[PDB]
Amino acid sequence: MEDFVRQCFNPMIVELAEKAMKEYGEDPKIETNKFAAICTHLEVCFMYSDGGSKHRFEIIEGRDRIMAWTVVNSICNTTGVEKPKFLPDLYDYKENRFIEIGVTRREVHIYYLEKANKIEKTHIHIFSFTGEEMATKADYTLDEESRARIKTRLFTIRQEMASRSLWDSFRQSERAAAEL
Ligand SMILES: COCCNC(=O)c1nc([C@@H]2CCCN2C(=O)COc2ccccc2)[nH]c(=O)c1O
Ligand SMILES: [Mn+2]
Ligand SMILES: [Mn+2]
């Protein structure tokens, strides 16, 4: 999986993922499913912002967690949006709401229900590796072409992993994390 990740993701994304794991005391060379999951989620967050104008989004994911909370506080202080209890992935400057992005190897609606349970003003948008998506109130934020690019990328990743016999382990690892 190490070779797959370094071959299919931008070096900057790989390095941010390595950094994140090291800060959490994890080895990218050992927890390789997590390594790929982090890369995939960060890439999706970048592709999501590309779906709006350059004025539309603040990307919160992939930044120093301590500093990210100060940006969240500045947004909440200036816009009057309620402060989220959990650090989100994006802020939408147009709709003035935070966004939580889910990327799951599980079923999109089960994942949505759990995320919603764990989260009230944050908008939730879930993507799968099988071309499915789910979003709060069926409000998908982006146009269909921007979302098609995301779904297509994730579908492509699943096929590439499957051809290297990595998909089944990657799939099961999200469920093992949920079981524990
Ligand atoms: C990880 O803790 C630092 C802040 N966590 C996030 O921001 C975040 N966490 C997760 C899931 C649920 C709780 C922990 N976790 C994972 O370890 C899965 O892998 C990821 C790790 C980081 C980013 C994306 C995926 N799911 C997301 O969608 C997400 O945005
Ligand atoms: Mn996040
Ligand atoms: Mn997320």
Numbering used by the authors: 1 to 53, 73 to 138, 141 to 201
From the paper:
The influenza virus RdRp is a heterotrimer that includes the polymerase catalytic subunit (PB1), the ‘cap-binding’ subunit (PB2), and the endonuclease-containing (PA) subunit.
Initial diamide compounds such as 6e (general structure 6: R1 = phenoxyacetyl, R2 = 2-methoxy ethylamine) showed relatively weak activity in the FP assay (Ki = 1.6 μM), but compounds such as 6f (general structure 6: R1 = 2, 6-dichlorobenzoyl, R2 = 2-phenethylamine) showed improved binding (Ki = 0.36 μM) for the amide series, although the potency was generally not as high as the corresponding carboxylate analogs.
